Antibody
Framework: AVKLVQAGGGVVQPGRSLRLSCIASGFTFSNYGMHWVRQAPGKGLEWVAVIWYNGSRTYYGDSVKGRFTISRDNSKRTLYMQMNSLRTEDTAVYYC??????????????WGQGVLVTVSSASTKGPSVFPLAPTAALGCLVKDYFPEPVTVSWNSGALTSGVHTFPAVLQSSGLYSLSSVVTVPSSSLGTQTYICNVNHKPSNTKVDKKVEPK | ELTQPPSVSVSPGQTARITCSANALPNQYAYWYQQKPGRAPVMVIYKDTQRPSGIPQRFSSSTSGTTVTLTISGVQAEDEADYYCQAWDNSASIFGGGTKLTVLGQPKAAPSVTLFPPSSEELQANKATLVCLISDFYPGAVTVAWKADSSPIKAGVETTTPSKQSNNKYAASSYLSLTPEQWKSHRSYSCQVTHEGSTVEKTVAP
């Protein structure tokens, strides 16, 4: 069947470069115009670039023009994208897609799986863990760490009932933040102690924070 | 440049309609894409009204003026997805912002909102983050807004995308970062969550 497989994703720093590739199967690659499209996490689709079936002309989207370069190798069934002058804002899942019309419709009939590119200038930074004091809800803000992941447990793992750790958000600084909240009985606020245990293995940081009523 | 509603929710078997508008659309061909969570887009409509081979006959599209409408007759559960219109001109493809279609499978449920002020520790670090946690709502689409006294704040906000919980209801979080002097210069701060046209609000004061 038609198959489009991207490769080349990763984490990279602003100002640096990255090259993505896409191998095609199931059709005569040299007969079709090919595109790259991107999708920032939790946002919509945005077109990046197109190359004609024979490599005679390329066109680029307004936010990537002059920084990204598309090329193809028709003998090897491969489409490439050279990304230079990377900005935080370029963080996204990148898809290659086939154009249906040989004369280029500028639409996309087959799409690959996509590959994530995260752009950040941050160095390994352990989090600042802050208590979110108060059925009552209480938790811990695990703020400003790099890179992913972080593990959050409650009371050295002893508590599981009603713990919800939310997805990390990559902030404009290029550092992540997340929260974990547990919902406990109001009677417990006297009978109990609650500690979130945070372990950020990339920076060898383990922090326990006691969440006390204010 | 293309406007689509953020979400639509319909009961199984009802007809869903999703509009896409722009003044240039009279002069352009529009295309529609379906994207299910985790998957890549699939083209469900080619050149304003044509249906690709492989796509169910319940999908159709029509044009009226500056608006093209995707119609899904007799919506099925499997049609729940984000739908994107797309168009363009000689040099570029442009996409609308996307519409979350929810095929209702349980009753609507209002969000629960908990808002936490910055801790003493954080303010001691000359820093301040307010955390708004939103849970147990269905359909999973919300608008989150922050206010300092009565003024809307847009700077310093980060909100995660709604995700299902076990219970099949959704949860999301939003953060507002401020300087300590900004925290002290207001009487209150609020997290306002709007879901199915009604707002839930929580307020904290310095």
């Amino acid at each position: 069947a038609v198959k489009l497989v991207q490769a080349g994703g990763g984490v990279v720093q602003p100002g640096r470069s990255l090259r993505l590739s896409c191998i095609a199967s199931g059709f005569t690659f040299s007969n079709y115009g090919m595109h790259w499209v991107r999708q920032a996490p939790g946002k919509g689709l945005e077109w990046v670039a197109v190359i004609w079936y024979n490599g005679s002309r390329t066109y680029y989207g307004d936010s990537v023009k002059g920084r990204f370069t598309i090329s193809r190798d028709n003998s090897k069934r491969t489409l490439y994208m050279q990304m230079n002058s990377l900005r935080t804002e370029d963080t996204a899942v990148y898809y290659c897609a086939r154009d249906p019309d040989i004369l280029t419709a500028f639409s996309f009939d087959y799409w690959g799986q996509g590959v994530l590119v995260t752009v950040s200038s941050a160095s390994t930074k352990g989090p600042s863990v802050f208590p979110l004091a108060p059925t009552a809800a209480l938790g811990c803000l695990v703020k400003d760490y790099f890179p992913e992941p972080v593990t959050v447990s409650w009371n050295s793992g002893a508590l599981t009932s009603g713990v919800h750790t939310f997805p990390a958000v990559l902030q404009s600084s290029g550092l992540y933040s997340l929260s974990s909240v547990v919902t406990v009985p109001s009677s417990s606020l006297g009978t109990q102690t609650y500690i979130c245990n945070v372990n950020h293995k990339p920076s060898n940081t383990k922090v326990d924070k006691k969440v006390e009523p204010k | 440049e293309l406007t689509q509603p953020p979400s639509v929710s319909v009961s199984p078997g009802q007809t869903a309609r999703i509009t896409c508008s722009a003044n240039a659309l009279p002069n352009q061909y529009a295309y529609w894409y379906q994207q299910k969570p985790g998957r890549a887009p699939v083209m469900v409509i080619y050149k304003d009204t044509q249906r690709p081979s492989g796509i169910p006959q319940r999908f159709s599209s029509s044009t009226s003026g500056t608006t093209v409408t995707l119609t899904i007759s007799g919506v099925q559960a499997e049609d729940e997805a984000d739908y994107y219109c797309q168009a363009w001109d000689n040099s570029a493809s442009i996409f609308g912002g996307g519409t979350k279609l929810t095929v209702l499978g349980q009753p609507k449920a209002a969000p629960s909102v908990t808002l936490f002020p910055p801790s003493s520790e954080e303010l001691q670090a000359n820093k301040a983050t307010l955390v708004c946690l939103i849970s147990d709502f269905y359909p999973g689409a919300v608008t989150v807004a922050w206010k300092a006294d009565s003024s809307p704040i847009k700077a310093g906000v980060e909100t995660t995308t709604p995700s299902k919980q076990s219970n099949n209801k959704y949860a999301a979080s939003s953060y507002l970062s401020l300087t300590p002097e900004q925290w002290k210069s207001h009487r209150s701060y609020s997290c306002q969550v709007t879901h199915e046209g009604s707002t839930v609000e929580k307020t904290v004061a310095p």
